[PDB]
Amino acid sequence: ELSHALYQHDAACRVIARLTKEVTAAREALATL
Amino acid sequence: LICSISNEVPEHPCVSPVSNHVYERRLIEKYIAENGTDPINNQPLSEEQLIDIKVAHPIRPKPPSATSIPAILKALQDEWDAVMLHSFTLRQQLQTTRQELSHALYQHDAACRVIARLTKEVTAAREALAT
Amino acid sequence: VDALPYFDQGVREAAAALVEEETRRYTDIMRNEFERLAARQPIELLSMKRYELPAPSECVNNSMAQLEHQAVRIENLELMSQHGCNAWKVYNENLVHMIEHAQKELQKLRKHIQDLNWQRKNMQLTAGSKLREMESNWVSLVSKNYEIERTI
Amino acid sequence: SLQAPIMLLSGHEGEVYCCKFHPNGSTLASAGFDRLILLWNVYGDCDNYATLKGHSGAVMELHYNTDGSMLFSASTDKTVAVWDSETGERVKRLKGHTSFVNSCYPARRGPQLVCTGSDDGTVKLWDIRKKAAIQTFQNTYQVLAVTFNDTSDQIISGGIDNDIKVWDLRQNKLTYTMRGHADSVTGLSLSSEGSYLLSNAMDNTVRVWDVRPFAPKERCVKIFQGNVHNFEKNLLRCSWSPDGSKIAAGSADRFVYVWDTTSRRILYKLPGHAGSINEVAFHPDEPIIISASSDKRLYMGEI
Amino acid sequence: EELKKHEDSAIPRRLECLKEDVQRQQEREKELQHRYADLLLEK
């Protein structure tokens, strides 16, 4: 349970890294438009 | 080659027919009397269900410098030291795993809230570019 | 939940701080009694520290103990030598059969897991392309909808 | 893959100029130089049952309706015969060209329309109910290939002037010209979306052109290579896959080229064709390719 | 074993979302043309 969690945690953590940079791209795009 | 309870190298290994796993007879006989089921698979198992196995026997070279004296004093002392300080240290390891479990699940759920918060943030920022 | 490991080839200190900020917000008899007491106290029970030292000039008994013990040792030594003399290496032969069996398991486990990893990797590259297809089409609309309105 | 590994479709006595898949895709109908059109059930054992005679020329262009109920093909004697898929009877023949009809297309969706092009340099719009031409567009050079957009507003014509021309049905004017071929255009075909038109030419290059209300204005969207034309001067036709991912075009080097729709990469280049290849067609549901050639045989490649 | 199952989950759903996300984008593309096409009708 510890191993499956820590793996899936840092896996789910990479979802945020991706999500944050796309969210950020939507801001300057709309802002500059 | 080993027993699947104590971590021994068995003197009279016996195999159970519900789950193919070799145990030392004394330790499997004790489990069946405590609760009549197979320790690993938790399946119904009795003493008559077991099957004794045969092998070329195991040999330990008793040290050349051995006697009743070291075997009573020095060797037996070290064995109950090694049993005592290991299980105490093993109880210390189990306590930290549960604490480090709590730091794992909290930091996990902390990340879930960031993602959920950023999932509302990103798509609405993309939507605003569409608008 | 979904986070592709194999596909996502493209910050840890940054994301750690954002995760940190969301954490700123949020059965034996008597045997067991003496064994747990011995481990807790950190003290082994004292054995017979007698046989080794002794003293010349009660000792008639202590002497007769020693003779019998010595005889047993010779008998045990012969028996021990007799077992060690031919068996001395028999245990080693058995210990090598016991060892190789563990490392065969190490391989069987190694092979399954590798296959699983490969499968996952292959699976990713599938979707990462499909996401790339979606984003290209996304950017096309984004500018298409504009160029439609600019002309109107 | 559906019951198709490769097979072999024969029966033709001359080059097989055109072949198209049943709108359903279950059945097929081909025609060529033999002045015969062949229908062989694609499924089961691939055997023809109904033959449609009534052509004093080369069934140059063969087409199908969105439904595919009505099939119309264009012959070399300047007369187009319209035959329903069921019962195979010459049902509506329209004769208005002074020379060979090189090609024909039928408008999908909107009320029934048919376009033709010929060696007299004209392009004609036909309403199947009138027994007379509706509009005539005099070019000046021989017209080889013609297709409608999905809105049924525009006619796209490829000739021997190396320039694809777009005609407006309401204005009756030369709306667009496309530059980019060094030689005659032999075959045009629209994407199922209306979005893109595929062209073969004697300039050695397969070119995709995008037709849109808002156009870049230099619509050389993509270029592909491999397709060879030679002294035979056969009309060469190309087709879009059901999903627009694949592009097939026949060649005179007996090689069935099929590029990737998005990466412009040769996905296939199958052999098994002795003579120059005149048309390649895609099954509407499954990955099945019908290749028709001047060696009088057909193959059913399965991908 | 479980990690592989997790990855499987991860795949099915990512694409289908982007697939439907793409379908909506195509609609805006599909209409914006028509208004441009109707510029020629007024002429």
UniProtKB/Swiss-Prot annotation, chain A:
Ubiquitous. Weakly expressed in senescent cells of different tissue origins. Highly expressed in tumor cell lines. The modification N6-acetyllysine is found at K21. The 7 WD repeats are necessary and sufficient to support interaction with the RPA complex. Disulfide bonds: none annotated. The chain holds residues 102 to 134 of 504 of the full protein. Homotetramer. Component of activated, catalytic and post-catalytic spliceosomes. Component of the Prp19 complex/PRP19C/Nineteen complex/NTC and related complexes described as PRP19-CDC5L splicing complex and PSO4 complex. A homotetramer of PRPF19, CDC5L, PLRG1 and BCAS2 constitute the core of those complexes. The interaction with CDC5L, PLRG1 and BCAS2 is direct within this core complex. At least three less stably associated proteins CTNNBL1, CWC15 and HSPA8 are found in the Prp19 complex. Ubiquitin-protein ligase which is a core component of several complexes mainly involved pre-mRNA splicing and DNA repair. Required for pre-mRNA splicing as component of the spliceosome. Core component of the PRP19C/Prp19 complex/NTC/Nineteen complex which is part of the spliceosome and participates in its assembly, its remodeling and is required for its activity. During assembly of the spliceosome, mediates 'Lys-63'-linked polyubiquitination of the U4 spliceosomal protein PRPF3. Belongs to the WD repeat PRP19 family. The gene is PRPF19.
Swiss-Prot record, chain C:
Its main location: nucleus. Required for pre-mRNA splicing as component of the activated spliceosome. Component of the PRP19-CDC5L complex that forms an integral part of the spliceosome and is required for activating pre-mRNA splicing. May have a scaffolding role in the spliceosome assembly as it contacts all other components of the core complex. The PRP19-CDC5L complex may also play a role in the response to DNA damage (DDR). It is found in: Nucleus; Nucleus, Nucleolus. It comes from the Eukaryota. Component of the pre-catalytic and catalytic spliceosome complexes. Component of the postcatalytic spliceosome P complex. Component of the PRP19-CDC5L splicing complex composed of a core complex comprising a homotetramer of PRPF19, CDC5L, PLRG1 and BCAS2, and at least three less stably associated proteins CTNNBL1, CWC15 and HSPA8. Interacts directly in the complex with PRPF19, CDC5L and PLRG1. GO terms for biological process: alternative mRNA splicing, via spliceosome; mRNA splicing, via spliceosome; oocyte development; ovarian follicle development; protein catabolic process; RNA splicing; RNA splicing, via transesterification reactions; spindle assembly. This is Pre-mRNA-splicing factor SPF27. Residues 91-152 form a coiled coil. Ubiquitously expressed. Keywords: Acetylation, Coiled coil, mRNA processing, mRNA splicing, Nucleus, Phosphoprotein, Spliceosome. Transmembrane segments: none annotated. It comes from Homo sapiens.
UniProtKB/Swiss-Prot annotation, chain D:
It is found in: Nucleus. Keywords: Isopeptide bond, Methylation, mRNA processing, mRNA splicing, Nucleus, Repeat, Spliceosome, Ubl conjugation, WD repeat. There is a cross-link at K217 (Glycyl lysine isopeptide (Lys-Gly) (interchain with G-Cter in SUMO2)). One of its GO terms (cellular component) is U5 snRNP. One of its GO terms (molecular function) is RNA binding. One of its GO terms (biological process) is RNA processing. It comes from the Eukaryota. WD repeats lie at residues 11-50, 54-93, 96-136, 138-177, 180-219, 230-269, 272-303. Required for pre-mRNA splicing as component of the activated spliceosome. Component of the U5 small nuclear ribonucleoprotein (snRNP) complex and the U4/U6-U5 tri-snRNP complex, building blocks of the spliceosome. As a component of the minor spliceosome, involved in the splicing of U12-type introns in pre-mRNAs. Component of the pre-catalytic and catalytic spliceosome complexes. Component of the postcatalytic spliceosome P complex. Part of the U5 snRNP complex. Interacts with PRPF8. Component of the U4/U6-U5 tri-snRNP complex composed of the U4, U6 and U5 snRNAs and at least PRPF3, PRPF4, PRPF6, PRPF8, PRPF31, SNRNP200, TXNL4A, WDR57, SNRNP40, DDX23, CD2BP2, PPIH, SNU13, EFTUD2, SART1 and USP39. Component of the minor spliceosome, which splices U12-type introns. This is U5 small nuclear ribonucleoprotein 40 kDa protein. The chain holds residues 54 to 356 of 357 of the full protein.
UniProtKB/Swiss-Prot annotation, chain E:
Ubiquitously expressed in both fetal and adult tissues. Residues 12-43 form a coiled coil. It is found in: Nucleus; Nucleus speckle; Cytoplasm. Phosphorylated on serine and threonine residues. Has no effect on subcellular location nor on homodimerization. Phosphorylated in vitro by CDK2. Phosphorylation enhances interaction with PPP1R8. DNA-binding protein involved in cell cycle control. May act as a transcription activator. Plays a role in pre-mRNA splicing as core component of precatalytic, catalytic and postcatalytic spliceosomal complexes. Component of the PRP19-CDC5L complex that forms an integral part of the spliceosome and is required for activating pre-mRNA splicing. The PRP19-CDC5L complex may also play a role in the response to DNA damage (DDR). As a component of the minor spliceosome, involved in the splicing of U12-type introns in pre-mRNAs. Belongs to the CEF1 family. It is linked to A chromosomal aberration involving CDC5L is found in multicystic renal dysplasia. Translocation t(6;19)(p21;q13.1) with USF2. This is Cell division cycle 5-like protein. It comes from Homo sapiens. The chain holds residues 753 to 795 of 802 of the full protein.
